[PDB]
Amino acid sequence: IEDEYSGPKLEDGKVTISFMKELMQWYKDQKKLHRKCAYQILVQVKEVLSKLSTLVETTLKETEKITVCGDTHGQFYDLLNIFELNGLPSETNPYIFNGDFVDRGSFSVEVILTLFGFKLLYPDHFHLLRGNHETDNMNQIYGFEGEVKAKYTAQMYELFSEVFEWLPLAQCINGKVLIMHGGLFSEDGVTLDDIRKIERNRQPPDSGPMCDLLWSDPQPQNGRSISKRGVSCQFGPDVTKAFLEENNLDYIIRSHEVKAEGYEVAHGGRCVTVFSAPNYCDQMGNKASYIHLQGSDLRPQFHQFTAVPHPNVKPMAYAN
Ligand SMILES: [Mn+2]
Ligand SMILES: [Mn+2]
Numbered sequence: 001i002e003d004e005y006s007g008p009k010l011e012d013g014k015v016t017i018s019f020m021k022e023l024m025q026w027y028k029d030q031k032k033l034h035r036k037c038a039y040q041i042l043v044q045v046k047e048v049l050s051k052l053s054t055l056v057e058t059t060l061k062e063t064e065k066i067t068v069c070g071d072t073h074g075q076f077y078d079l080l081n082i083f084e085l086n087g088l089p090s091e092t093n094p095y096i097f098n099g100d101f102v103d104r105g106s107f108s109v110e111v112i113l114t115l116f117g118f119k120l121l122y123p124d125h126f127h128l129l130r131g132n133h134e135t136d137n138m139n140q141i142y143g144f145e146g147e148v149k150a151k152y153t154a155q156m157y158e159l160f161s162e163v164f165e166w167l168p169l170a171q172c173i174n175g176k177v178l179i180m181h182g183g184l185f186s187e188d189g190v191t192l193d194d195i196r197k198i199e200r201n202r203q204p205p206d207s208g209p210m211c212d213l214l215w216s217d218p219q220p221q222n223g224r225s226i227s228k229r230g231v232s233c234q235f236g237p238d239v240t241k242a243f244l245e246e247n248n249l250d251y252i253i254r255s256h257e258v259k260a261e262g263y264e265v266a267h268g269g270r271c272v273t274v275f276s277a278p279n280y281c282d283q284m285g286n287k288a289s290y291i292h293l294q295g296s297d298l299r300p301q302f303h304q305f306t307a308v309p310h311p312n313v314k315p316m317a318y319a320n
Pocket of ligand 2: 255
């Protein structure tokens with residue numbers, strides 16, 4: 001006996017569609033991806049991500065489509081449910097996952113390695129944007145670091161941290177829709193140029209554009225406020241509108257907050273929240289949603305969904 005009982009294996013070190021199907025099934029059955037394959041996925045996706053701009057600029061032709069998902073937080077069985085409701089990722093069914101893949105939920109390893117696998121398989125049609133939880137300080141507290149150390153080793157966690165540093169911070173579709181995890185900026189006048197200029201391969205600063213992209217929240221009233229989170233700001237509809245007008249944009253899609261209906265349309269339609277972790281932490285009872293967009297019609301169409309069963313591992317079981 002050697003590795004016959006160790007599960008899915010890459011094909012000469014590369015991700016294939018049959019590997020991804022084997023992986024999702026193996027994870028569904030609560031089994032672990034061989035550490036050598038996990039390592040190969042991480043080294044390769046680090047290389048892919050490190051060549052991207054901090055701002056991914058994507059063009060959708062008139063009849064092309066894309067799906068935008070918000071926070072998933074290690075709810076792997078809900079992630080599979082997204083793919084069963086909305087189809088597997090492919091070149092004709094592209095996806096954007098808008099940050100916060102890990103922490104809180106206790107299948108964060110399974111979520112993130114599935115997402116990285118699909119990033120390697122469909123690199124121009126499967127997009128991952130950094131959330132505030134793809135950071136060391138958050139992983140240390142909120143489960144992911146403990147989960148990686150439990151399933152693999154501290155060295156594997158170090159590699160995850162390095163890979164997260166190369167996740168892009170925002171994505172712009174057709175020069176019209178800007179997507180980021182958190183939101184807009186603590187000062188006026190920021191442009192797409194400034195986002196492209198962020199040297200993102202780091203942990204986020206305590207303030208400034210990289211912080212805001214991962215951490216800010218919309219508020220209903222005009223202006224800005226100190227964030228209730230102690231980090232970044234809250235930004236009003238006039239902030240959103242000035243930013244969109246200066247940058248020739250129509251609206252933003254962000255995530256980073258739970259909503260009972262899975263989404264919220266705010267700022268007169270200019271600031272949309274999408275959140276894709278239903279019954280968050282097995283307690284919130286929220287619906288989740290994902291957004292459908294078309295190249296010829298970038299209006300957001302929302303699809304709601306509810307949580308599905310998962311194995312009996314508690315949320316935050318690996319947290320501090
Ligand atoms: Mn979150
Ligand atoms: Mn967040």
